Amino acid sequence: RHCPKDWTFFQGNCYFMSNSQRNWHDSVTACQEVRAQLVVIKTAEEQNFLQLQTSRSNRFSWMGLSDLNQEGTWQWVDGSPLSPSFQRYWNSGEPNNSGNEDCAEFSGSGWNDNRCDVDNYWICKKPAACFRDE
Ligand SMILES: N=C(N)NCc1cn([C@@H]2[C@@H](OCCCl)O[C@H](CO)[C@@H](O)[C@@H]2O)nn1
Ligand SMILES: [Ca+2]
Ligand SMILES: [Cl-]
Numbered sequence: 001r002h003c004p005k006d007w008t009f010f011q012g013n014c015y016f017m018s019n020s021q022r023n024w025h026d027s028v029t030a031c032q033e034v035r036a037q038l039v040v041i042k043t044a045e046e047q048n049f050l051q052l053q054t055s056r057s058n059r060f061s062w063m064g065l066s067d068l069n070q071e072g073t074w075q076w077v078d079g080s081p082l083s084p085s086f087q088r089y090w091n092s093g094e095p096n097n098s099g100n101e102d103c104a105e106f107s108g109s110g111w112n113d114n115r116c117d118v119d120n121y122w123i124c125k126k127p128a129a130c131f132r133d134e
Contacts, residue, residue: 001128004034009128010049015039016124017053017061024103024114027062027122028077035133036124038064040076047089050123054106062122063111065104067095074104 003014014036022030024038031038041047041063054061064077074082074095095101095113103116106123114120126133 002130002132003128004133008053010046011043012128013046013125014128014133015050015053017057017059018122018124021119021121023119024062024066024116027120028064030122031064031124034124034126036126038062038077039123039125040064040078040080041086044085047086051089051106051109054123055109059106059121060112060114061106062120063104063106064125065111066116067102067113068116 001009001012003009007014007016016031016034016036018030028038039050041050050063065074065082067074069075076082089111091107091110091112094111097113099115101113101115103114105112105114105120
């Protein structure tokens with residue numbers, strides 16, 4: 001199974017680590033432009049994959065998670081809630097809402113809540129295909 005050039009294959013999906021920095025809303029749009037989605041994490045193994053991808057490039061990166069709803073709870077850009085077994089991935093002391101932080105990112109060894117208006121790297125996810133989707 002194939003991924004586009006400069007996407008990474010992991011367990012049937014393709015992952016794009018951005019070369020540029022954009023705000024969270026612009027990162028949502030950027031992933032949609034390439035038939036993809038600002039990354040929604042579905043399994044522990046996927047989180048482990050992504051956390052090490054980001055940790056080693058030492059890059060802070062947007063994921064598809066925000067509390068921009070009425071409840072103020074963390075929900076994925078596909079509308080699914082943050083499951084209890086993922087609360088462990090927040091960094092020590094996070095989320096801390098330090099300056100109106102509604103958008104989740106990879107930060108060091110876990111997750112951070114950041115201001116949505118910050119320019120950050122991002123990761124897109126789409127299914128692997130029989131062809132390279134350029
Ligand atoms: N995309 C990037 N640069 N991510 C890293 C990052 C973290 N923060 C904040 C900062 O707050 C301190 C005042 Cl800037 O660091 C605290 C952790 O100590 C945070 O909880 C808080 O979200 N701002 N950028
Ligand atoms: Ca924070
Ligand atoms: Cl880019």
